[PDB]
Design a protein around this ligand. Structure first.
Ligand SMILES: CCCCCCCC(=O)OC[C@H](COP(=O)(O)O[C@@H]1[C@H](O)[C@H](O)[C@@H](OP(=O)(O)O)[C@H](OP(=O)(O)O)[C@H]1O)OC(=O)CCCCCCC
Ligand SMILES: CCCCCCCC(=O)OC[C@H](COP(=O)(O)O[C@@H]1[C@H](O)[C@H](O)[C@@H](OP(=O)(O)O)[C@H](OP(=O)(O)O)[C@H]1O)OC(=O)CCCCCCC
Ligand SMILES: CCCCCCCCCCCC(=O)OC[C@H](COP(=O)(O)OCC[N+](C)(C)C)OC(=O)CCCCCCCCCCC
Ligand SMILES: CCCCCCCCCCCC(=O)OC[C@H](COP(=O)(O)OCC[N+](C)(C)C)OC(=O)CCCCCCCCCCC
Ligand SMILES: CCCCCCCCCCCC(=O)OC[C@H](COP(=O)(O)OCC[N+](C)(C)C)OC(=O)CCCCCCCCCCC
Ligand SMILES: CCCCCCCCCCCC(=O)OC[C@H](COP(=O)(O)OCC[N+](C)(C)C)OC(=O)CCCCCCCCCCC
Ligand SMILES: *[C@@H]1O[C@H](CO)[C@@H](O)[C@H](O)[C@H]1NC(C)=O
Ligand SMILES: *[C@@H]1O[C@H](CO)[C@@H](O)[C@H](O)[C@H]1NC(C)=O
Lengths: 457, 460
């Protein structure tokens, strides 16, 4: 039916664009041990399995910001400790399977009340700040690799990568990032604007990210001489690093023996991954069986070097017979995402600057709905300009600013922990905001102030 | 007085930024025959004279878009016919003085009624479109001069001008233009926003253009290796092009004999200049006759020295905004003019201002000038569905297709004006625009009705 096709196309694009961006980011961060190919095939397989055996087909599984942050932290930890990153991921997946087969007996569903708007907004703000910082750091790295000079060695080897500075690479990359961000934001505004027929305007606005990506890809395509770093996608179903690892990762070590102490100590990183996935599932949903399936599949996906995914409820806004239609649409979207690895010529001409502009746009748009962001903005507005909201009206302005400052201190502590070599503890530390709201904030604030500032809805 | 100093500073900056951007544009168009130095000196002298002997001290005098367009058209005409541009301007100024002494004999107060919102908004839209087109054409010229190539020549002569493509000149120029436009628009939005204390927010928003110019100038100043074209200002009170012309230019000719036929035919370009100046004065004001006569006489006198003629504008005064207040306004205007004239002494500072940031300011001015135009509003309404049309008298009392027909007729007029500007008959553009006055009066009532015309074309 034509109804299924349009929704399938929309969801496929809205899942592929983040998938492509996160695959590029993962390939850059993890030295191409896990790239766009692995992320795409993992997303496809896990989406098919979740559609077939998921309680709620509305959920679509895919890589997210917190998972990328944890992958970067684990890669850095393995590099510092001289361990195999992929085998460590395999053992984390083993311990994740153990965790999911352990939680079912105890039914740890009472923790949902512990996670509140406090933790949810802190997590979302941290993720958006991480996105913005990653985009700006990539821009700085591009400008450092190819600085603005008057003389360049115009005969430089480029088979692995540019071995020296190049004239127009940095400025064109900055232009592409800025243009992608500007076009995506303008298309979003047009979707929220009052121009053009409503149906056509909404259709154009829904596809804002793919349209901006296509525009900037064409812009870079017609600039023939200038070199810009492109997305690294292998031709066919390949691991994107043949020298590094194969498809089926052998446990106990790939190039060197895996220590037993790491095998036993992989439980803690598995606990941190479970915490991250649980937090993402809670923020997307607002339930217990679907989380076990995703983490259980993530443990199996680690054996093949594939990443683990999360809940990421975005499909409900666009959407027994309805359940069957949703199941079929999700399965078709997953199949299309998997087959998107076949169009390697198309993906190999997508610059990384466009994807990082999309990353910045995603962070900026994620900042929009956060109440913590609203209060941070109110920190700069005069009190007369504060909106008519319960926390402004029923709480003193300095008390609300103190609440915002405490949340800012929490964000700063999380950022310091992430920058600290002990970045693997970033999930746990974030969950430490749960006792703070429960056992420490009531000491400073009152019940009414806490209810107004931190509310379920 | 402390209150006088702040107003002087604000008006000085709001007059200097257009002064420097128009000086750069004139230096580009006229091959530095008239540049930043001449424009600044003319602006200072005419501002002092207008403050001392002007009926309305609120009026400010400076170069504007229509004057730049006419100067470009006259330069193109002179280069096509082989005439001397700077010497032809002398006879245009002579005929301007003749025109002002003729008009004072037969006071033409009836023409003010003829110019209406129709003509004034068509004029403003054409000027904004010209600004945007000039910025984009300069960007295209920059990208053509220094294309994005894999290999450039290591050493190229740059004493007269870069003789070949350069690595990062085009992309950095585009980045500077975009950044200047973005920062200016963001500061304009911040001025009307609800952040920061109201006094601080307003004073930050008022200085949006100087702040953006300073930010982008510093950004360029910290890119040591990359080259971008910068504003050309002589060290001291010097002619922009000493080889081309001196200070006092001989009316009979500088390097070639001036034809007598051109001496007599300079009346028509003088009439076109008078039409442009009158249209600008009518747009800004709505003593006007005396002010415009004084301004045109000063411009005709300044044409003897190779300096541009100015127009009447109230942008800076309105943005800043019984006998003692008038005296304070005169003193503030005189001080602003003196500071504008002394700005040439800051040659080291002005020589580090790229042309990309100035063209970004040009684009920002062109975009901002479209805010109050009803023609722009109806052009936007052409795309919005009729449900989303606002509660405006022409929306409610006129059928939507009739309003769109009105907008289409205005669009056709704008297209005709653009075609005339593109053709070698661009010198006739001031005349053709005045031809919209009969069209509204004698042709529009044939198609529309009295109520529709009064709602669409209203005085206020
Ligand atoms: C260069 C491009 C220029 C395009 C021209 C710019 C397009 C343009 O200006 O639209 C004008 C007109 C819209 O008016 P119109 O009211 O008939 O269109 C919609 C219709 O009325 C729906 O019933 C409305 O829903 P609702 O019951 O009220 O709730 C809807 O409102 P909303 O749903 O928005 O709230 C309306 O938008 O439609 C055309 O003629 C397009 C023909 C060209 C075809 C479109 C072009 C592909
Ligand atoms: C960067 C340093 C800035 C100084 C920092 C000094 C910070 C400080 O102490 O003031 C708090 C400031 C002003 O708020 P504040 O209560 O004083 O109210 C302002 C002013 O005092 C008048 O009361 C208001 O006009 P009105 O008489 O009521 O009609 C005016 O609104 P309007 O005039 O726009 O209508 C207000 O701007 O509110 C911020 O959040 C700015 C934080 C920015 C940090
Ligand atoms: C959205 C707005 C983003 C603005 C910032 C963009 C990222 C660049 C940050 C500096 C990188 C750096 O420090 O680069 C260091 C390298 C040299 O490094 P090296 O000696 O080879 O090591 O200098 C360069 O390449 C030249 C100077 C940096 C050029 C940056 C131009 C930015 C223009 C901004 C217009 C709004
Ligand atoms: C920028 C900040 C502007 C604040 C402002 O503008 O704060 C205005 C208020 C108004 O106070 P009032 O109740 O209207 O008097 O000042 C206060 O006392 C509020 C200050 C409370 C603590 C502020 C903490 C800020 C974050 C600290 C992160 C470590
Ligand atoms: C909304 C748009 C804003 C930005 C507008 C930019 C205008 C520049 C047009 C130059 C055309 C030209 O003239 O290009 C000519 C030259 C080739 O030189 P040639 O013809 O061999 O020389 C004789 O092309 C180039 O080197 C490459 C042109 C493309 C680079 C600019 C990319 C802009 C990306 C915009 C993202 C929003
Ligand atoms: C070079 C010469 C160019 C001349 C251009 C003239 C354009 C005049 C259009 C009159 C149409 C009319 O009359 O449309 C009226 C009816 C209203 O319908 P109703 O009365 O509600 O029934 O259509 C509409 O909904 C309006 C839809 C307009 C879409 C086309 C916009 C194109 C804008 C292009 C310029 C920015
Ligand atoms: C993965 O590929 C990168 C190049 O993309 C290479 O530098 C790295 O050594 C590879 N990893 C291995 C061989 O383990
Ligand atoms: C000055 O005028 C001459 C022609 O008389 C021209 O060749 C030269 O380029 C001009 N100077 C500048 C800076 O444009």
């Amino acid at each position: 039916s034509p109804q299924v096709l349009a929704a399938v196309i929309f969801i496929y694009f809205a899942a592929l664009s983040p998938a492509i961006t996160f695959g590029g980011l993962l390939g850059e961060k993890t030295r191409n041990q896990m790239g766009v190919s692995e992320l795409l095939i993992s997303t496809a397989v896990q989406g098919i399995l979740f559609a077939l055996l998921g309680a709620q087909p509305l959920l679509v599984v895919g890589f997210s910001g917190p998972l990328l942050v944890f992958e970067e932290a684990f890669f850095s930890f393995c590099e510092t400790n001289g361990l195999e990153y992929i085998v460590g991921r395999v053992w984390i997946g083993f311990w994740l399977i153990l965790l999911v087969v352990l939680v079912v007996a105890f039914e740890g569903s009472f923790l949902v009340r512990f996670i509140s708007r406090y933790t949810q907004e802190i997590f979302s703000f941290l993720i958006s700040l991480i996105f913005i910082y990653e985009t700006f750091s990539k821009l700085i790295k591009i400008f450092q690799d190819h600085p603005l000079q008057k003389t360049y060695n115009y005969n430089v080897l480029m088979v692995p990568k540019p071995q020296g500075p190049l004239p127009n690479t940095a400025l064109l990359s900055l232009v592409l990032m800025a243009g992608t961000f500007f076009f995506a934001m303008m298309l979003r505004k047009f979707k929220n604007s009052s121009y053009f027929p409503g149906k056509l305007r909404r259709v154009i606005g829904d596809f804002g990210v793919p349209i901006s990506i296509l525009i900037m890809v064409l812009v870079d395509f017609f600039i023939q001489d200038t070199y810009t770093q492109k997305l690294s996608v292998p031709d066919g179903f390949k691991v994107s690093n043949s020298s590094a690892r194969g498809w089926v990762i052998h446990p106990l070590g790939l190039r060197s023996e895996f220590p037993i102490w790491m095998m036993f100590a992989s439980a803690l990183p598995a606990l941190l991954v479970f915490i991250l996935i649980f937090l993402e599932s809670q923020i997307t949903t607002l339930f217990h069986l679907d989380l076990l399936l995703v983490v259980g599949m993530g443990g199996v996906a680690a054996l093949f070097g594939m990443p683990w995914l999360s809940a990421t409820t975005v499909r409900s806004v666009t959407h027994i017979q309805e359940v069957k239609e949703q199941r079929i649409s999700g399965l078709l979207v997953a199949v299309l995402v998997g087959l998107s690895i076949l169009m390697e010529p198309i993906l190999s001409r997508i610059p990384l600057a466009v994807l990082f502009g999309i990353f910045l746009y995603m962070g900026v748009t994620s900042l929009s709905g956060i109440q913590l962001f609203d209060r941070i903005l109110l920190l700069f507005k005069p009190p007369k300009y504060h909106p008519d909201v319960p926390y402004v009206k029923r709480v003193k302005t300095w008390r609300m600013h103190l609440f915002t400052g405490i949340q800012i201190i929490c964000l700063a502590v999380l950022w310091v922990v992430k920058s600290t070599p002990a970045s693997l503890a970033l999930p746990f530390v974030l969950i430490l905001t749960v006792p703070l709201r429960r056992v420490l904030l009531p000491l400073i604030f009152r019940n009414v102030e806490l209810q107004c500032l931190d509310a379920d809805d």
